[PDB]
């Protein structure tokens, strides 16, 4: 899937930009990003999960 490949590239870019600063994302952040990359839920539902995440 072209769409899922674009989502995976966005997620890898989000991880890289923090890793290049020496920042590891919170486990909850990574879990929500992974679900989006895999097509488990929409961009809107991804946004809801991020805003509702307990850190």
């Amino acid at each position: 899937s072209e769409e899922l490949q674009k989502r995976r590239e966005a997620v890898d870019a989000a991880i890289s930009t923090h890793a290049i600063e020496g920042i590891t994302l919170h486990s909850k952040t990574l879990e929500i990003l992974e679900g989006y990359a895999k097509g488990e839920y929409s961009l809107e539902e991804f946004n809801t999960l991020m805003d509702n995440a307990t850190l």
Partner: protein, 213 residues
């Protein structure tokens, strides 16, 4: 009520004033990175702009940091009025590297505007780096990246803003810029070489390695 650099940070703290009210650096970093990751995902689904310039760079900072900083999208040379009634400004900024003798001094005062306008001139003259031979694209991408490193236009979030700006610039020029193969160490090494030695070749080598047409 004179604007000052001190008003960017909480009283008696080294932590930047933020919308989360978090003074603990670890917890602040976690939440700021969480929101920046959310913004990144939404940004990569957004249609590319017709023009790349310093206004677009400020928009990207606004997108990445709107939920973290009241001053998201605002540059450090311009007095910024916080909701708390204080006014912050930081015309003078420097960064020390633990392996380097002398600090890197960023653009002073209104030289921040000059740095932003510098990239605008390059991007107008070179048509957003589109329709160029590969060698020219790599050279000007490196010139832009090194120029933004010196300008350091924002109080914080420069690196993150600069990288997505350059990914999007590359995408509009039919290139995929892959920062995932670049380590924190390699990024720092090439940036110090351009800043202190005036040597752009390590940065150009890095961009050549990570640019895929």
């Amino acid at each position: 009520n004179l604007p000052l650099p001190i008003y960017y940070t909480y009283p008696n703290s080294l932590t930047l004033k933020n919308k989360y009210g978090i003074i603990d650096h670890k917890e602040f970093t976690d939440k700021c990175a969480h929101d920046s990751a959310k913004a990144t995902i939404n940004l990569h689904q957004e249609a590319l702009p017709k023009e790349f310039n310093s206004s677009y760079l400020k928009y990207l900072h606004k997108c990445l940091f709107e939920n973290t900083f009241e001053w998201a999208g605002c540059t450090r040379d311009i007095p910024f009025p916080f909701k708390d009634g204080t006014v912050a400004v930081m015309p003078e900024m420097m960064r020390s590297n633990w392996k380097t003798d002398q600090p890197i001094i960023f653009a002073i005062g209104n030289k921040v505007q000059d740095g932003l306008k510098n990239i605008d001139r390059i991007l107008v003259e070179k048509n957003n780096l589109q329709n160029l031979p590969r060698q020219e694209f790599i050279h000007h991408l490196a010139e832009i990246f090194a120029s933004l490193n010196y300008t350091h236009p924002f109080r914080e979030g420069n690196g993150r803003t600069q990288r997505i700006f350059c990914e999007k610039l590359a995408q509009a020029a039919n290139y995929n810029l892959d920062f995932s193969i670049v380590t924190k160490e390699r990024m720092s090494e090439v940036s110090i070489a351009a800043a202190q030695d005036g040597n752009l070749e390590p940065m150009k080598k890095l961009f050549d390695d990570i640019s895929h047409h």
